[PDB]
RNA sequence: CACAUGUUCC
RNA sequence: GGUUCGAAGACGAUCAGAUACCGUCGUAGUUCCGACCAUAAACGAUGCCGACUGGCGAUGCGGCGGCGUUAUUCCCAUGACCCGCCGGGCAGCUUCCGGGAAACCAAAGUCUUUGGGUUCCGGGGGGAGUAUGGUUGCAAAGCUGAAACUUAAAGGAAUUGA
């Protein structure tokens, strides 16, 4: 790195501890706020009940009417 | 300021080896430095050296040949055992055809190939290839 | 380059520059052999033998070519030692 | 993308100098950044030099002169057509044009 | 309002190089000389080249031409390049020799010379152009 | 088919006076004729078109596109090279990369690893090559491992006959133009890097121009 | 060359350099020729050592005769000051001349008519002949350049310090070189001086050509 | 110009801080 | 001294 | 205390619209002192110390020596020029040193031939320097500082047309 001593280990991994949070992959897997916001809640499949049907207008040139469902 | 006596010595001679000088002037002379090049005397990588042994930090003038492409300095001085003398050469040396890792031990400053013989590793200095 | 048993396995041995004491690459397009004629000690005329030298292209592109060959020819006695 | 070594200014160790006002406009430019034309000017160009001579006091009276140090900015010098845009190979040529006429 | 192009100039020059001896000075004199020595497609093109043929000899009559290869001029340049002057100005009896050039000769093999003249050193060693 | 010689070293090929192309790369005289490699080692010289890529130029009237082909050449014994050609047609761009690929062959160094028994299988030392932002390294490998590298530099490494290879790269390797030529500098560095085996000073053989200068003025201009 | 009893610095050559103005240098200095300069005289002029001129002439004259074929040795003088000397050396020694207006591509284009592969190159000065030195790094060609105290030493293999500016000083250089290269090869002896005068190689201004012709008539 | 892209957010903050004290 | 703007896909 | 200039604001012209550019004013301000705030494209967009590596012409400080010129003319000695050099001070030209993606740089070089020492700081673009919390300030505001969500792009250098 930038500091190159022999007993700088606390200078080393504390200067690697806090920008691990600025990495998105480490922050996502260790901050539970998105885990709370995960509507699966740690799952992969979920049952659902329909209340209406919603037609979604598509994007820029590739345009159509998309069949979407309120769940 | 001046932190290392051996790192600046190898950087000064590598700055002139790419240029092609035959005689250079290195500002320090340490106990480690004067017997550091004696390893290259037994390996024939650099020509014979003359020093100015005075009441100051002496100046060493070494004869320059082309046999040493680059001598490397590592900072700081990591500890090396014989459970990992094969470990560094996988990332540090070009091969076992040539390339040398030098170490300073209780036997003295000495090479990894002969460190296998006397069975003593330890405090390390650098590598020349 | 020779093997365990002692046979030269390399397909050629590359040249060496005599100034910087380093080898010459296969695609070095500026390396030059200096061909120096031999002068007889009593006749002064051409003999039939040479004192060949070599210079690399990097020394040419900084400008230290002639200073080296003067030093190279001093050791071989071509340049006068009194100077 | 960087265009000059010194970016239109002749400041290398100052950091801060005294601004000066321009001439064509009132543009506030630092002194070592504006173009300083020390224009030399005779009072009458071609017309009255013969006309003063027939109404002067002494024999071959010498005419006085004006010395004003103009300070044009970047936009005011190009609007007065003094400086010119140059190729990047010819930008480094900072020698002044000669004084042939 | 007339410029000789590349086609006219390449046809006119090669005619002069090979057929110098057959050309004259008036335009009409060598105009029909060019008729027999080349295959000219049209009446106009023959008169176009031959004017520039006559235009170049006025350059030749003025003096030598850069882009031409004449055997006679080549021999005349060899006659003047191998011209022999009188005795050399390298071997004189009077030679200006600066004070600082003696001690390099004095420490050499021939210290004392015969036909040399020691000169005065120039007092005041200012030799550089003013700045600006 | 009937070759007319031009270059001075080119005449030396047909006179049966030079034994191999190794003496040319001893003296490193430049090569401009493309049949000399065919003459000596044109038996197993194998061609391969890497890729086609429609590079384009924007013009005032319409659009303007010309192609570009990449070729790795060699026999499976020490000699490989690279060829680059950007031409209008895919046929001429492919042959242009074929025809210049002879002109830029660099002999690689095969060396031993540990014991020196058998055949030289790997790179003698750790060397790298520099061009653009793509980095590549020739790392020695143990016996019987193979060319452990990306598929495009994998092809150029078994293209020379060097078998055990280890690599370590950095950069936008998707630009394989900058990635193939990075190996080219690395393999060319072996004959520029000084070896402790090659501390023996080289006796200077006399140049073939100097050796055969009598014949160089009697059979041509 | 080195301490050779046949090849000392000669008395009859002493008077030629002093009258010509060869030992005088320029106002400035190039960093390369520290060993080739004795001392600085008055009014900013350097002094070029004659012993260094003799020795570097021999090493230059070693390589000329070492190439046993003089038919493939090229000579360049793009400046008009060395024009007259070098042209007739092609006829005398056997060389191939490059006398002004050099064409780029003569060493890389196989289609050009003037496609050459010589063995040795002769340069009157590196500044006017920098373009020939460019292709010297692409094809392996030795060169000689007559260098001043300010001339660059880029892509120059063998260099001889002298004055490449004065008219009387330049034509002395090729004449003495021609007088030497004839001595190593078995054509002309060494005890007797050469019959041909050194004035034959001095470039003459066209002002004096029409003026000396007046003295003839 | 990005200078008043910042100043637009600055007017939003003064408006948003004033409704804090109203409650 | 003024001159602002030319609806989306290719 | 307000000379000049000049936010806000007013008036006269242009505009289809000026709440703008132009001109006439003109308040806070711009000037000084005592208390605040600590933001700038605070830029060399390039942290600090230290060894080495192209020359070249300069300039400034101090020191060394020297033909000579000019004043104290009345010289020793001091000054001003000229020649070099020494440590560094802002610097400048060239470049196949070398680096870089290139523009370019003698450092942005000594970097896969990877480690001289050390501080601050970034991890795709937005959301966002935002919410909240704490803290300084009379205030404007400053410092620290998110998340949900959204996107297959955002961006830098370079070539050619327009």
Residue numbers in the entry:
A (entry chain AS23): 2 to 72
B (entry chain AS22): 2 to 130
C (entry chain AS21): 1 to 83
D (entry chain AS26): 2 to 102
E (entry chain AS17): 2 to 133
F (entry chain AS02): 58 to 278
G (entry chain AS00): 2 to 218
H (entry chain AL41): 2 to 24
Quote the passages of the study that discuss this structure, keeping the authors' original sentences.
Toxic dipeptide-repeat (DPR) proteins are produced from expanded G4C2 repeats in the C9ORF72 gene, the most common genetic cause of amyotrophic lateral sclerosis (ALS) and frontotemporal dementia (FTD). Two DPR proteins, poly-PR and poly-GR, repress cellular translation but the molecular mechanism remains unknown. High-resolution cryogenic electron microscopy (cryo-EM) reveals that poly-PR and poly-GR block the polypeptide tunnel of the ribosome, extending into the peptidyl-transferase center (PTC). Our results demonstrate that strong and specific binding of poly-PR and poly-GR in the ribosomal tunnel blocks translation, revealing the structural basis of their toxicity in C9ORF72-ALS/FTD.
The structure of the polypeptide tunnel, where poly-PR binds, is nearly fully conserved between yeast and mammals. Poly-PR density is strongest in the tunnel constriction near A3908 of 28S rRNA. From here, poly-PR reaches into the PTC and either competes with P-site tRNA or packs on the ribose of the 3′ terminal nucleotide of deacylated tRNA. We found that PR20 starts to inhibit peptidyl transfer at ~100 nM, comparable to or exceeding that of PTC-binding small-molecule inhibitors of mammalian translation, such as harringtonine and nagilactone C57. Indeed, toe-printing of polysome fractions shows that ribosomes accumulate at the start codon in the presence of PR20 and harringtonine, but ribosomes accumulate within the open reading frame in the presence of GR20, cycloheximide, and GDPCP. These data indicate that PR20 functions as both a translation initiation and elongation inhibitor, whereas GR20 predominantly inhibits elongation.
